[PDB]
Subunit: 384 residues, 4 copies
């Protein structure tokens, strides 16, 4: 189970670089030079790295320091063969963003947020990124009166429309992906799930430029089925990117390594991604637990990729097993894929076998055989 | 706080008519004749009632018994002045629907589900209903392999498209509203939240015919902010109907009377509905607890309407209070409603006050004054 | 992975016998004769069965019908070699228990509940049961004023004390196990977790007669770590019995087959039970999904036992792996098992290496190596 | 609704002093001098303040700086009349505690944790504290193999037993209160609820010295009923202290001001505390949202006390209302407080009215009238 760059595994600088500061504790690890992270990730078999602007260029850096930082970073990419497929903006750490970026109540902050984002889109394009992610972590509220959500959605649409006008006018070949999260650090965050993000995109002026970047743990913080949500995103043609990690239920955002948390959900996710032919990066947005030293950081990163590859093998074996293929037919998955009424509305209305002479009791007695199918899935996952 | 029919309060037959059967217990109340429910609800001050087909006409009824049941029902409506603004299909109780209706794996069941629905659309139109609700309670899965969600969404789109073709071809003036629920009775239900439903509607052939019927408790079963979700539905122009009740957190669907459960969420909901000018029915989908006899059923129903009217008064007092209006300006809710960049993209790019010469530290130091605003909201809710 | 009676697997009559009635649907399966369930479970490799009084003898049965039902049941046990290690009372289905049994507000109901329980203790002892389980499913409330919880705990203590006096006075060799559940069917249930049950037991007059019967899914309905709770129960010497099933997060009680739901929690549970030498029954309290016919019921039951046996093998391989044993020492699990201060209080106070000259920065820099240990656990679970 | 010191309101230094650092953002407020917090809280009407050792004396302070800091603090207490009823240890912020204090795998860390705690017990006693709180925020795990929970409970018992030996040997009049939390910052925290803490205390060598310090938001992070848990703690005689705040459901620990979050749970909590005659401090462990400047900090603190006093008035009016008293009798709360069988076991067995001639159908038909009682409670809370 050794990763190759053709497995398309990517990591954020802020993942292995997380120093371990949490709401109740100081950092347990020293800062990582982005250049060292690139080289260590390259040796593990990753395909590339992603960044927030403030990960690479500390806030307030002079334009000269900014150019020096980018040059060192570019040299590390050249030295390693690593790519930068995705970038994002930090609109959440600095105190100015305490009430949001694109939907801050203060108009001057919203303008500043847009200019900060546009500056990093230029840099992302320069470094070859194909997707630009927006996680509106501070867009939301702790109390009901603080945010008129209709006005806030107007402002969010205005911001994304302006960003689309910018990339269109510059001729950039980059697309946007909205990353939903239900809560944390705000009490409730706007566009809290994949569904809300997908719905919002359809109201943008140029919807074809926007998709979603769902994260395993975020949908699970709402108790939702992550593979189901990914299926809906794929169905809509909007899965532009994906963030892989682990989460144990409805609680704070754990960002465990992928494979940890809900293991069977991870199996069904990989099954779906591989069956659907998802060709984007397999990006890990995880945090090595602050119990770990730097050797544990690399072991945790390695485990992300290993667990994906193990699950990929087991899901492939599941789908290729002739007894599973017969069980799928026994459960009528083949019939689910057939149109209900390709014969059309009036033929359905005239079809006495669909109502007047339909034997409901015979249909009701047919078992779905789902439990046998699921135990075959369990046996394959466990190698049993 | 006495309701009038002009308050637009409606109840489902299945609400006050719930006999109290739960997964662990027998019924504690006798069946209610729909005619008696209409008259008792009329005396409480309700504006109308809603029904599933199987609430009014027991499953398997002959066409003659069906006509007799409708006639008795129509006479009760005429006797009381009660209206029927909404109707729905029961595609969840009968065993034939154990794997769903519109997305059952068995094709013959899906055809039967559509014919059962179409028959009740005709009846709903006959009785004057303006909205037809679809709650896909059995559409979903308990295990990963049982349902290919992309194929299931294809089937769900096919079913709703066929329904839209039906109403269009018949010239009916009725619209559809999808009611999301995250889980129960299926392990995960398709279109689990308002967001997922809104996103799905945009892929239908005639999206203007479809909106959402969100329910307080259902979004709270995902830990989501119900007023936020309603705001997004209103923002999209898709709030066709609404189901009011109470829910205490992430657990089984409690269907408590409205006002119970999360009281402050109920206050912010009423504030939003009244401020936005929502003109649809205020529908209660609640269950009188099975601890109650029939006098408790009517007390619980009365409390639904009373709590709405109390909250309506308190929210109106909140918005009209001059000290609240000044606090809203102190928190810059006025600035949230102003466009970020009506001056346009290039002016924003050339605006040095938006980035180069923006004083981030002065902006960051400005308190949002949200806690004072929220305590004014608390004082008004409590009459303090 | 074939079960033998020496694996101590047991099932409730109400598990494979569940007809599939849920809050929104009719039964999908016919009733099972308890005699047929005993024989089918015996053929699958189970060691025994458990029952509620009302599973075996329908409510209201004459004393003659009761004797006939027990005799048929006893003959099936004799024919199959099946044992009855546990029994319980149904104090939740009949409408008289709508506000509880032992803590119903009505005093006459509480007396009736106790007499119904005592009658079944006599039967359980006659059939050889060693543990008597109490699940107070109706003890609780939907609203705050309905139940004074201090008075209700007084009544619950009174009931269990009377039961202990009964078994002591009759010389029975049976013990009691309280089964906690946080909610459903009541809005909140008294003694909602393993912890609350353990704490309550210490206030009973004869605490040695009472322990807990924790259920996987119930603790997970509170988002708790089930292996952690079992460890505390074992630590207290109170794990008298255990209910195994699966649950996907905080939602309604799913009662999925064991192994489904949180797979890694199931692995750590089996690891703990086998390492601690738990010698009680491995009881499955699960519901075959109502999608299933009777062949699916037996496949689901078989999968309970299969998944336990697979996990038992993998946990044993984990603990026996020399690289895991070295990793445990690397993470200082050996030091966790050593006393902090067997040298005593005053020696600790005089130990300058414990404070004055303790190098906190050297200690803080030591990685815990937990992520490498957890990936070894993952590899072993998956057979990788 | 103006607080007086006789209302016994207390605040932690770390509450109004929270600078607003969260997992995703920098501090939004400057540090508060503890002396200024004491004076500002005194002017709001608080009775006293609480502290962690590291709040008052920064980690690593020389013994001379420590004496200067305590003297300045003592002078502020003398100047204001403020008391220090409770103190606690910070065993969670410094990196050395990354795997816990009392249950760290490393033995030398556990010894250091005990010495750090003992040093602050001496200081707490010097300043007049009656309760010493232990919140084991780092005791727990993110993965299953990292912590043997039985060994960890052995170590936790060893630590608390040693602390009890210390206070007994020094003749101190101080008691201990364990503060449970289910998760955050560890993936799962040991003793996650009030129940688990109560159960653990009964295994300590001197259980009379230990009780619980439950926090509103912590029990709600497990979806539990906080008033129910407080009732069980009072029933056990173990409510030594209480932490008041607000929380919106199962998510990260919000620490909202008291009254926010679940408003009706706050009403039933105050009802219980006042009816039971709880005489301990009313302590607020809350965080002013980081959106706020220092004027918002004091408004949030003021709102804690105001909301308690409003709810106290409404609960008192509820219990004193003659129509509520009659409704309580209608719901048989009076019968709940009467013994089930003060006549004894054998009389219950001989009582034919308790079983043989009990009319279950008449009993089952009696409504509990809980919904009318709850709407009276709602009307009183809202002043309607
Ligand atoms: Mg995350
Ligand atoms: Mg992410
Ligand atoms: Mg509902
Ligand atoms: Mg509804
Ligand atoms: Mg269960
Ligand atoms: Mg059970
Ligand atoms: Mg807290
Ligand atoms: Mg606290």
């Amino acid at each position: 189970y050794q990763p190759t760059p053709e497995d398309r595994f990517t990591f954020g600088l802020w993942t292995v670089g997380w120093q371990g500061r949490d709401p109740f504790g100081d950092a347990t690890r020293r800062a990582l030079d982005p250049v060292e992270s690139v080289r260590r990730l390259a040796e593990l078999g990753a395909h590339g790295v992603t960044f927030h602007d403030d990960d690479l260029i500390p806030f307030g850096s002079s334009d000269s320091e900014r150019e020096e930082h980018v040059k060192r970073f570019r040299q590390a990419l050249d030295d390693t063969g690593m790519k930068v497929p995705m970038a994002t903006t930090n609109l959440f750490t600095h105190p100015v963003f305490k009430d949001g970026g694109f939907t801050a109540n203060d108009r001057d902050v919203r303008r500043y947020a847009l200019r900060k984002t546009i500056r990093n889109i230029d840099l992302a394009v320069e470094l070859g990124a194909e997707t630009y992610v927006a996680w509106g972590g501070r867009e939301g509220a702790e109390s009901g009166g603080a945010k008129d959500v209709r006005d806030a959605l107007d402002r969010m649409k205005e911001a994304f429309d302006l960003l689309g006008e910018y990339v269109t006018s510059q001729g950039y070949d980059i697309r946007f992906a909205i990353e939903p999260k239900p809560n944390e650090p705000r009490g409730d965050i706007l566009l809290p799930t994949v569904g809300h993000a997908l719905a919002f995109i359809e109201r943008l002026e140029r919807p074809e430029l926007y998709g979603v970047n769902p994260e395993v743990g975020h949908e699970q913080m709402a108790g939702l089925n992550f593979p189901h949500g990914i299926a809906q995103a794929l169905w809509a043609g909007k899965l532009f990117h994906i963030d892989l990690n682990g989460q144990n239920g409805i609680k704070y955002d754990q960002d465990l390594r992928f494979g940890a948390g809900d293991l069977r959900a991870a199996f069904w996710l990989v099954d779906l991604l591989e069956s659907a032919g998802y060709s984007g990066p397999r990006h890990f947005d995880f945090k090595p637990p602050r119990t770990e030293d730097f050797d544990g950081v690399w072991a945790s990163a390695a485990g992300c990729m290993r667990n994906y590859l193990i699950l990929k093998e087991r899901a492939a074996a599941f789908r290729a097993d002739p007894e599973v293929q017969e069980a799928l037919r026994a459960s009528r998955l083949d019939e689910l894929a057939r149109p209900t009424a390709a014969d059309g509305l009036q033929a359905l209305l005239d079809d006495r076998s669909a109502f007047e002479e339909f034997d409901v009791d015979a249909a009701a007695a047919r078992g779905m055989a789902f439990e046998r199918l699921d135990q075959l899935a369990m046996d394959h996952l466990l190698g049993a």
